[PDB]
């Protein structure tokens, strides 16, 4: 403190140099606005009778300029534990050339602690003047504009004239490391059996800052104690940290932990199995104990069957599966192995799509088709449409016969059984026509020859979708005709005047009412009659059709 300070003999040359340099430029910086000289220091003439240095004037120009600076030199000798001077300094006089001594490694706070010793000591005295608050960092952008004229003035008793008392949230990540340091004890202080709430207000806070995506692995350093102590609390936060793209030694041990129960797995386990779920998410997290997962190839080959294959998603026996799928196409439980064949599918090549053609034969009379179609069209690129023209269209023809059988049953209790029987194709077609849709996004440029009823299969289904799919809309746990809209473009590749008149009898079978300037449009058109338009007319007829007070106290009474 400056009041009970140690006033030495070296607080005399630095106090008079922190006061004169604070009072030398008082006479020159105001002369541009007519700093006059008269009988008073007034503002009418803008005069400055106090325009004098505090060292060269009389004793009266120093009680509020040098005595506040000697007490500041009693504060600059009490701000830090370094009270010494080892150099000299640096009308209309000017201050010392001290604009190069900026905020250094030690002169940053020492030129600001003398400001605080001039502010907070006088502000506590201002609080002793109010009854009988410009803070340091709580001064805002407008308050620091009024807090910088004296801080630079207090920067002359810290780095000038040798009066030298000289001496983002990775710390939160260090606190997270301290949390991990706390986790070394907190996962041991209940093993052999106020701060838990400190761990409570953290699991959601960890999830937050990661969504705002030097010391990158410092957070990954914290990603350590969780996986060991476990195998629902911060497990979601771990999954939240999983997407946030040395410790991989525990992976083979976890694989050994999976192998710890894999002996009698043919016929706890909660912490074990849940570990691999977040690991699998962490596996394809860097998808912008090396071959230790060879146990995984024999894991599903041993005996949550496909759920094991669900974790599998991170070579010459493919030809050995080519007949095995074909024998299954001639025919079960190799779909998880096919998922294990899908786990390393396209690494970079023609009959890879024949696997789906093999899968279609099983699905020609057919289970969990959700994951079976999920990772399906990840490389649907490679033609095969000629077999596909006979494939799904017959499946559509099976489906066209299916609903017609349903409608014939609906052409006359017992109808509730048929209202649940229509969910068979509903799970099927939603699993079917999806990978086929991405195949259509390849032939669109190409077919611009045998899609003449391939479009009509959708529209017949759409007319069937036109109650009749209310037990299909509930199978969500709209792709019902969206692909038909995508396939509607090539269906317009067939002078439609009667088609414009066709949309009337199809909203009144129009096989009787339809029985009986434009050169630029017909330019490229030139560059088997009646039903070559009625089919397309019925499509848009449904497609456009697809596009097609209470008083106060009574409401206070019915409540």
């Amino acid at each position: 403190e400056t009041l009970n300070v140690i006033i030495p003999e070296k607080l005399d040359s630095f106090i008079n140099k922190f006061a004169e340099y604070t009072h030398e430029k008082w006479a020159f910086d105001k002369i541009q606005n007519n700093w006059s000289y008269g009988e008073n220091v007034d503002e009418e003439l803008k005069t400055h009778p106090m325009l004098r240095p505090y060292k060269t004037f009389s004793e009266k120009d120093k009680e509020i300029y040098r005595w506040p600076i000697k007490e500041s030199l009693k504060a600059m000798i009490a701000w830090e534990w370094t009270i010494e001077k080892a150099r000299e300094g640096e009308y209309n006089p000017q201050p010392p050339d001290l604009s190069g001594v900026t905020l250094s490694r030690e002169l940053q706070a020492m030129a600001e602690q003398l400001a605080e010793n001039y502010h907070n000591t006088w502000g506590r005295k201002k609080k002793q003047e109010l009854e009988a608050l410009v803070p340091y960092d709580t001064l805002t952008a407008k308050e620091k504009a009024r807090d910088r004229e004296k801080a630079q003035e207090l920067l002359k008793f810290l780095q000038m004239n040798g009066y030298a008392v000289t001496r983002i949230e990775k710390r939160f990540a260090f606190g997270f490391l301290q949390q991990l340091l706390r986790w070394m004890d907190i996962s041991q202080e209940f093993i052999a059996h106020k701060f838990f709430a400190k761990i409570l207000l953290p699991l959601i806070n960890q999830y937050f800052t990661n969504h705002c995506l030097l010391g990158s692995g410092g957070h990954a350093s914290n990603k350590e104690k969780e996986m060991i102590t476990s195998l629902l609390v911060r497990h979601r936060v771990s999954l939240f940290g999983t997407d946030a793209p040395t410790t991989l030694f525990q992976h083979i041990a976890q694989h050994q932990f999976g192998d710890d129960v894999i002996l009698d797995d043919v016929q706890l386990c909660s912490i074990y199995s849940l570990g691999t779920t977040k690991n699998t998410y962490v596996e394809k997290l860097r998808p912008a104990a090396a071959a230790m997962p060879v146990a995984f190839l024999e894991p599903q080959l041993n005996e949550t069957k496909s759920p094991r294959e669900r974790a599998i998603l991170g070579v010459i026996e493919i030809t050995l599966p080519m007949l095995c799928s074909y024998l299954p196409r001639w025919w079960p439980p190799a779909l998880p192995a096919g998922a294990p064949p899908p786990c390393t599918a396209v690494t970079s090549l023609g009959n890879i799509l024949r696997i789906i053609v093999n899968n279609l034969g099983i699905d020609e009379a057919t289970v969990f088709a959700q994951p079976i179609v999920s990772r399906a069209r990840p490389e649907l690129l490679h033609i095969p449409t000629i077999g596909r023209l006979r494939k799904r269209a017959g499946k559509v023809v099976a489906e066209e016969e299916q609903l017609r059988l349903e409608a014939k049953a609906e052409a006359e209790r017992d109808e509730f059984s048929v209202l649940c029987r229509d969910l068979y194709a509903l799970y099927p077609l939603l699993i079917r026509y999806v990978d086929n849709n991405r195949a259509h996004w390849l032939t669109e440029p190409n077919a611009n020859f045998r899609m003449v009823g391939e479009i009509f299969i959708y529209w017949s289904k759409s007319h069937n979708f036109k109650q009749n799919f209310v037990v299909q809309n509930e199978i969500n746990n709209t792709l019902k005709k969206m692909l038909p809209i995508g396939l509607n473009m090539c269906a317009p590749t067939d002078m439609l005047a009667k088609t414009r008149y066709a949309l009337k009898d199809t909203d009144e079978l129009q096989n009787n009412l339809h029985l009986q300037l434009r050169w630029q449009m017909a330019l490229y058109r030139g560059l088997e009659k009646i039903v070559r338009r009625v089919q397309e007319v019925s499509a848009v007829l449904y497609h456009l059709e697809q596009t097609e007070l209470l008083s106060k106290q009574r409401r206070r009474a019915v409540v």
Binding site: L550, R555, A557, V558, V559
Partner: protein, 139 residues
């Protein structure tokens, strides 16, 4: 009014008021009004006692005394009946409401509504939950 209180609490409020009646003339002082409330169980702050007597010499009798806690019992239940409302509405008692039954359960609710107003009060709230239905019903 004085209909929201049923009879047995006032059968308890009488002798609770009468025991601390200072003279048997049915009156009390202003300070004992909090002391009886400690025996009731409802313990409000000191700030919740001036506005009682600001609403009404310092002489309080059983006429004026009923009007205090009648103002202090309706507010503790008028914002609470929206919780006890939904208990027979849904099936299991959770919050999801099938809109199929609500098109015809409101035509025999006893308030004798029609089919017109109940269609005026369903789409402004397939399935609407419990808390958006009352938000347009309690107004």
């Amino acid at each position: 009014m004085a209909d929201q209180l049923t009879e047995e609490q006032i059968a308890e409020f009488k002798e609770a008021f009468s025991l601390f009646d200072k003279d048997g003339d049915g009156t009390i002082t202003t300070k004992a009004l909090g002391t009886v409330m400690r025996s009731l169980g409802q313990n409000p702050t000191e700030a919740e006692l001036q506005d009682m007597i600001n609403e009404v010499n310092g002489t309080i009798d059983f006429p004026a005394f009923l009007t205090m806690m009648a103002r202090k019992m309706k507010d503790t239940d008028s914002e609470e009946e929206i919780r006890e409302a939904f208990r027979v509405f849904d099936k299991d008692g959770n919050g999801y409401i099938s809109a199929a039954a609500l098109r015809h359960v409101m035509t025999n609710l006893g308030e004798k509504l029609t089919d017109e107003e109940v269609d005026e009060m369903i789409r402004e709230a397939g399935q609407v939950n419990y808390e958006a239905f009352v938000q347009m019903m309690t107004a």
